[PDB]
Write a protein that binds this ligand. Structure first.
Ligand code: NAP
Ligand code: FID
Length: 315
């Protein structure tokens, strides 16, 4: 099936288009091509600095009646410098304005770590440490709940939350809305079995980011493992007459995950969507799972002393 049921009663497309690192002069065409070839979910964020341009594409396709607003599933994220109560609505409303939407289908807390508010997305001290905010995540969550009650967002969720942090929200006194989604890094080198089983056991849908191992990550090193070039994965793809990317996107689909590969390349955008026509065997799935090496693309390395840094914990 193309969509998965959320704990808010809405359906979320299991395949979406990622937009981190999509250049502002390429992303409008990338999103327009994506909608034309069947994507109905776009993953966005204010700190990707391209929401205006994503929005231009969405609006054109709504205007052209290629799609109806109800058929789209648009996701964005609250940056770390907006965890204060008083700043959450404005940050949401800036994203809405940029995307030229009157609601978000899903709004996520981008990281559990709050940072000092200001113009800087990564405010730094004299030695390069991130300057934290004393806001705690449960107060941030109440602010996210308010956004649902004001009709600005249909669902709220979290991202890069470890199991104890998901637990903290689930055990929040006075909890009004559970998180719908936890969006986390997930691929055959970071298989996330423990955290996925915890979230799914609680009715929280997991979204897999960097599913192709983010080859365009700004900090890529030559010595790093490459999913797209791993002969073992290429062999599975060749057996199925699919590309390696296509196996990497179908893998999380069969774990009941949502997945959000990024591309600005028209041919790759179309390719990446043709993953509903084949199935990986359970053996293929267990084999892909065996490649785990707890390798992360996104480790937020400037925030390792933050009290809420999520990746000291095993999971
Ligand atoms: N919540 C968070 O903290 C968080 C963190 C990281 C990512 N995300 C979200 O997850 C998305 C996906 O992650 P990501 O951007 O890190 O990386 P990714 O989707 O794993 O990899 C994107 C890279 O793969 C290339 N690519 C795409 N399709 C390909 C194909 N069929 N064959 C060969 N190469 C292909 C893209 O190239 P071209 O673009 O040049 O075609 C780009 O260089 C992001 O864009 C963002 O929306 C969220
Ligand atoms: N260092 C990290 O782990 C993250 C990853 C990350 N990518 C992403 O999609 N969400 C993120 O927060 C990101 C994106 C940026 F635009 C700038 C920094 C950045 O850092």
């Amino acid at each position: 099936a193309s969509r998965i049921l959320l704990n808010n009663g809405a359906k979320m497309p299991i395949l979406g288009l990622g937009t981190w690192k999509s250049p502002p002069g390429q992303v409008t065409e990338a999103v327009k091509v994506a909608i034309d070839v069947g994507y109905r979910h776009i993953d966005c964020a204010h700190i990707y600095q391209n929401e205006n341009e994503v929005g231009v594409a969405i609006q054109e396709k709504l205007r052209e009646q290629v799609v109806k607003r109800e058929e789209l599933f648009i996701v964005s994220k609250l940056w770390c410098t907006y965890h204060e109560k008083g700043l959450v609505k404005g940050a949401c409303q800036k994203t809405l304005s940029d995307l030229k939407l009157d609601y978000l289908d899903l709004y996520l807390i981008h990281w559990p770590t709050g940072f000092k508010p200001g113009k800087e997305f990564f405010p730094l001290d004299e030695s390069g440490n991130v300057v934290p905010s004393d806001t705690n995540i449960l107060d941030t969550w109440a602010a996210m709940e308010e956004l649902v009650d004001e009709g600005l967002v249909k669902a709220i969720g979290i991202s890069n939350f470890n199991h104890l942090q998901v637990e903290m929200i689930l055990n929040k006194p006075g909890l009004k809305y559970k998180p719908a989604v936890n969006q986390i890094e997930c691929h055959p080198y970071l298989t996330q079995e423990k955290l996925i089983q915890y979230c799914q056991s609680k009715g929280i849908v997991v979204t897999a980011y960097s599913p192709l191992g983010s080859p365009d990550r700004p900090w890529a090193k030559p010595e790093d493992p490459s999913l797209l070039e791993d002969p073992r994965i290429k062999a599975i793809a060749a057996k199925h007459n699919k590309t390696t990317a296509q196996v990497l996107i179908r893998f999380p689909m069969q774990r009941n995950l949502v997945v959000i590969p990024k591309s600005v390349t028209p041919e790759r955008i179309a390719e990446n969507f043709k993953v509903f026509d084949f199935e990986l065997s359970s053996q293929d799935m267990t084999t892909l799972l065996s490649y785990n090496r707890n390798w992360r693309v996104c480790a937020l390395l400037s925030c390792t002393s933050h009290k809420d840094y999520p990746f000291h914990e095993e999971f």
